[PDB]
Design a protein around this motif. Structure first.
Motif, PDB file in Angstrom:
ATOM      1  N   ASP A 193       2.570   8.991  -8.436  1.00 47.50           N
ATOM      2  CA  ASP A 193       2.974   9.106  -7.043  1.00 47.50           C
ATOM      3  C   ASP A 193       2.798   7.825  -6.212  1.00 47.50           C
ATOM      4  N   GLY A 194       2.237   6.763  -6.802  1.00 48.68           N
ATOM      5  CA  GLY A 194       2.209   5.430  -6.224  1.00 48.68           C
ATOM      6  C   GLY A 194       0.919   4.981  -5.589  1.00 48.68           C
ATOM      7  N   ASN A 195      -0.173   5.762  -5.651  1.00 47.03           N
ATOM      8  CA  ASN A 195      -1.436   5.253  -5.106  1.00 47.03           C
ATOM      9  C   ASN A 195      -2.124   4.464  -6.175  1.00 47.03           C
ATOM     10  N   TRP A 226      -5.079   3.458  -8.438  1.00 43.00           N
ATOM     11  CA  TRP A 226      -6.209   4.144  -9.025  1.00 43.00           C
ATOM     12  C   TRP A 226      -7.332   3.223  -9.506  1.00 43.00           C
ATOM     13  N   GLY A 255      -1.132   5.688 -10.022  1.00 46.44           N
ATOM     14  CA  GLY A 255      -0.619   6.999 -10.382  1.00 46.44           C
ATOM     15  C   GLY A 255       0.890   7.060 -10.242  1.00 46.44           C
TER      16      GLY A 255
HETATM   17 CL   LIG Z   1      -1.056   8.629  -7.072  1.00 42.67          CL
END
Ligand SMILES: [Cl-]
Length: 135
Positions: free
Chosen positions: A33-35, A37, A31
């Motif tokens: 925001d950097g997580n 997926w 994503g």
């Molecule tokens: Cl994310």
């Protein structure tokens, strides 16, 4: 279409490329925001600084130049991308290519005999589909 991001890894990114019998070494989708997926089973051990530096490069192309692109501590030399859209890097027997979508970032990692253009075609075909789907 499917209701899971993992499907795009399993049923597109990791599939054999144009009947060559070759495939990406690994792939993942993050994503904005950097997580993570979705990921393939050998996607490397990425760290948050590395993913942030890539998010930064989509915003400000050229920001990685002094350092290179790191992923799981491996350094890739940046090669021409598409500003705000595609990031590419090269290492000695392979490389990386990253396509931004509306919600996400699609990562492909390859090794010889896969080449930079093959990476680009796999990841960009997916990313173009995802954008068309509002993702
Ligand atoms: Cl994310």
């Amino acid at each position: 279409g499917s209701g899971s991001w993992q499907t795009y890894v399993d049923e597109h990114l990791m599939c054999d490329i144009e009947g060559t019998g070759q495939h990406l070494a690994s792939a993942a989708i993050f994503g904005t925001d950097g997580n993570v997926w979705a990921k393939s089973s050998s996607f490397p051990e990425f760290k948050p600084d590395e993913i942030n530096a890539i998010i930064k490069e989509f915003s400000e192309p050229g920001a990685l130049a002094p350092t290179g692109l790191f992923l799981a501590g491996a350094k890739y030399m940046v090669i021409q991308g598409e500003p705000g859209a595609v990031i590419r890097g090269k290492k000695g027997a392979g490389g990386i290519c990253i396509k931004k979508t509306g919600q996400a970032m699609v990562f492909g990692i390859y090794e010889e005999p896969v080449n930079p253009g093959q990476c680009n075609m796999v990841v960009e075909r997916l990313g173009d589909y995802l954008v068309d789907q509002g993702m």
